[PDB]
Amino acid sequence: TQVEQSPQSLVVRQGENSVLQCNYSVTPDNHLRWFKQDTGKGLVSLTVLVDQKDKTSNGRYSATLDKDAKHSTLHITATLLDDTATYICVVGDRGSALGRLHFGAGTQLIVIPDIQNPDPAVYQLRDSKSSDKSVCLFTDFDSQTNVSQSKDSDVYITDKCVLDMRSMDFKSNSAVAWSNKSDFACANAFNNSIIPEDTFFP
Amino acid sequence: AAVTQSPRNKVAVTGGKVTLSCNQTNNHNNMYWYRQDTGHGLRLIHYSYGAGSTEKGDIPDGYKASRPSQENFSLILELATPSQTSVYFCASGDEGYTQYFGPGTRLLVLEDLKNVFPPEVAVFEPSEAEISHTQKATLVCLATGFYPDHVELSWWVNGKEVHSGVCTDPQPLKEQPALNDSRYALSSRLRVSATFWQNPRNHFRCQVQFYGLSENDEWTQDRAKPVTQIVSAEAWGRAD
Amino acid sequence: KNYTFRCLQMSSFANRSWSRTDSVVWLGDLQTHRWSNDSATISFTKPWSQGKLSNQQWEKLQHMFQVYRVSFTRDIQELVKMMSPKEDYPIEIQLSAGCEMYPGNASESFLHVAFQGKYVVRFWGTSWQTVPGAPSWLDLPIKVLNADQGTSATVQMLLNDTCPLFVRGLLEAGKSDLEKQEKPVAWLSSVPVCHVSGFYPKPVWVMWMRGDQEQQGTHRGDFLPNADETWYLQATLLACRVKHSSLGGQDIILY
Amino acid sequence: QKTPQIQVYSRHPPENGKPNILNCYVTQFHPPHIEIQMLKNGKKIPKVEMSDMSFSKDWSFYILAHTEFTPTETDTYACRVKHASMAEPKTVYWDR
Ligand SMILES: CCCCCCCCCCCCCCCCCCCCCCCCCC(=O)N[C@@H](CO[C@H]1O[C@H](COC(=O)CCc2ccccc2)[C@H](O)[C@H](O)[C@H]1O)[C@H](O)CCCCCCCCCCCCCCC
Ligand SMILES: *[C@@H]1O[C@H](CO)[C@@H](O[C@@H]2O[C@H](CO)[C@@H](O)[C@H](O)[C@H]2NC(C)=O)[C@H](O)[C@H]1NC(C)=O
Ligand SMILES: *[C@@H]1O[C@H](CO)[C@@H](O)[C@H](O)[C@H]1NC(C)=O
Ligand SMILES: *[C@@H]1O[C@H](CO)[C@@H](O)[C@H](O)[C@H]1NC(C)=O
């Protein structure tokens, strides 16, 4: 391919900076655009670089372009959970609609969220309809906690998912477990995982 | 300058005819069709410089384009093959170098539709233990037994969609991972303040938009046709 | 006295796949360069064709023309797609670019484009424009070409700055070949004609005289080129007098 | 579209038995694709040189063909041209 991106993927912690590279062999190189693509969603333009030696800024994003080196850098200053996306580099070979866009395959960025005040606990939630059905919710655990899949096929355990209560600037991690078997209870739900020593079981 | 695509997800069968539509009201002369695959950047299939015109892109084979008007540009897959399983993007532009992209269309081409199933949806109420311990209330939603993974889960509070305090699994689970054409299960959580959940006037709803069979798709099975539908479960707040 | 520098580009588009572009460069009536479709590089046809440019300055400029040749070709092909079915192949595009050098530091630059042998477009000031008589469908191609700010800035720089700079140096380096004198040789013949061949420069006087009185009848033909960069002329209708700068007062009288 | 004009002339004054150069100047044609052959006795001369194709201020194409030749009282010299503007090729004979 004429457009190469590096790294292929990276994992950073909230507040850390991310530096993304793009190198191309596209001739001529009229402009270079950086796109942000959230999983499942579409392409959002972050910036366009047009001059021989160019520099742009858009809030926490900043970029450079050196047409002689046929290279561009994207900087994300103090990364946030919301920066978890694919960053795509595109080189346009004309300054008009007569041009073709040459797309890089992307860089996947994962941002690890800051969990201010952990409170690991496992709660039992009952169905609003039946009553004879429930789920186990492992929540308010720190980022150093890994949730592992169940050793039992009839037991379902989801992965880590972080929600943001934006109004209260509060973030929380959680995994859900369920089963239709009698031998299943919340005290034993996440047994196959390494959960904290403080984990509250009510 | 906006671009719209229809449908959002599509499940088709091998040898079937698929039409992916794109609409723009920007009075843009030029429109473009791309496909996105993992390990690849977007690749041009076909484009159009105006109504009546269609031009072959880099990877045209298996596709036909139609520009019946300035607004609409269609991608026609006359004989769908599983290699055409991809995410399809449409863009438009004027005489300038900017192409305005559409939201996408995930297409899945299957050998047959005999294993398509809508989800079952259940809402699980917050625990009183969580309420007293954290002064917060997490609702959990569970969409089970659906196939394929063409679903959009959303939370609605008093008839308005919410995003704050929401987290949906980035990937679904396989209910029967031994079986090759396994059904999926997806979970989601909505966390509110205890006093918000305490209000019996607050109506919480978990909605799952399923993409399955259309009116035009054939169905010869004893069970109900697994058509594109909304499946949902509700819960009301409580002082308890 | 005044020398016109012109880069003449000839681009043929037979169909969607086939195309060739060939260029020739002239300083007055002397060919300075040739750039065949077959050649990756511009060829010099005079020892002084690089003018006063450095090997590095010549290379940077050549690299620009190489990118331009490939890009122009695809742009014309994309413009034919855009205009279909109104305009189709075969298509001929001729481009004439350069500058005129006047006394002092005076210069006038031009970039004229002909479509199917008819002058339709020019680059004027900061943008492309159509000229009187051009068909109106060319307004969409001109709009698209003018959207390309990068090509416009480059063209403005080449016409306003590069062409005058290069030609001043070229005029210096090529002074001896441009100011060269070549004596015309004349012979008479008539079938039921004054042939004058081998003169340089082009300005010549050929006349049919009845003693001291000139003849109004005499028809001076077109200036026909010789392959050794000299000229040929005919005068039809008694003596043939020819006056050329190389003769220095000693006119040729052929009875 | 545009029909060609052919002009056949000698570089030096002709003299039977003396070697000279015959010129064939093809002008005013469009499209620029053309095929030019110079003949001796109706047979194509092999060492024919072609100048680069160019065009005048009026946008019309031109090209000079030339070959060395030693004229005689019996030898016939011509310039045949094939262009799409003509159904049949145009042959112009050299006349001193
Ligand atoms: C005028 C004469 C000058 C005197 C020099 C004497 C030397 C003698 C040697 C002569 C041999 C050559 C003879 C060939 C004849 C040439 C005729 C003159 C034409 C000069 C045009 C030069 C344009 C240069 C820009 C270029 O290549 N641009 C091309 C690429 O552009 C891209 O890449 C660029 C990328 O461009 C850059 O990076 C340029 C940087 C750069 C680098 C070095 C130097 C300067 C600038 C930039 O990033 C752009 O933004 C980007 O889009 C662009 O595609 C060219 C399009 C031009 C089309 C004009 C034709 C008009 C058509 C009208 C007819 C319509 C018919 C309709 C059909 C249905
Ligand atoms: C190149 O020369 C042209 C003149 O031929 C300049 O064109 C003028 O540009 C200004 C604005 O920059 C306009 O107000 C005038 O109307 C233009 N003149 C014409 C005749 O259109 C041009 O700016 C020069 N460009 C460079 C880069 O030197
Ligand atoms: C395109 O034109 C060339 C030259 O005129 C010709 O030889 C070739 O066969 C043509 N190609 C097609 C696809 O007609
Ligand atoms: C003209 O040159 C280009 C690049 O060198 C080439 O691809 C093309 O085939 C050439 N055209 C002809 C007719 O040879």
TrEMBL record, chain C:
Domain of life per record: Eukaryota
Domain Ig-like: 184-246
Topological type in the membrane: Single-pass type I membrane protein
Subcellular locations according to the entry: Cell membrane; Endosome membrane; Lysosome membrane
UniProt keyword terms in alphabetical order: Cell membrane, Endosome, Glycoprotein, Immunity, Immunoglobulin domain, Innate immunity, Lysosome, Membrane, Signal, Transmembrane, Transmembrane helix
Major location category of this protein: membrane
Any one Gene Ontology BP term: positive regulation of interleukin-2 production
Record-level GO cellular component terms: endosome membrane; external side of plasma membrane; lysosomal membrane
Cell membrane as UniProt keyword: yes
Function of the protein: Antigen-presenting protein that binds self and non-self glycolipids and presents them to T-cell receptors on natural killer T-cells.
Subunit structure and binding partners: Heterodimer with B2M (beta-2-microglobulin). Interacts with MHC II and CD74.
The protein's name in its UniProt record: CD1d1 antigen
Origin species: Mus musculus
Residues of the full protein shown: 24 to 296 of 336
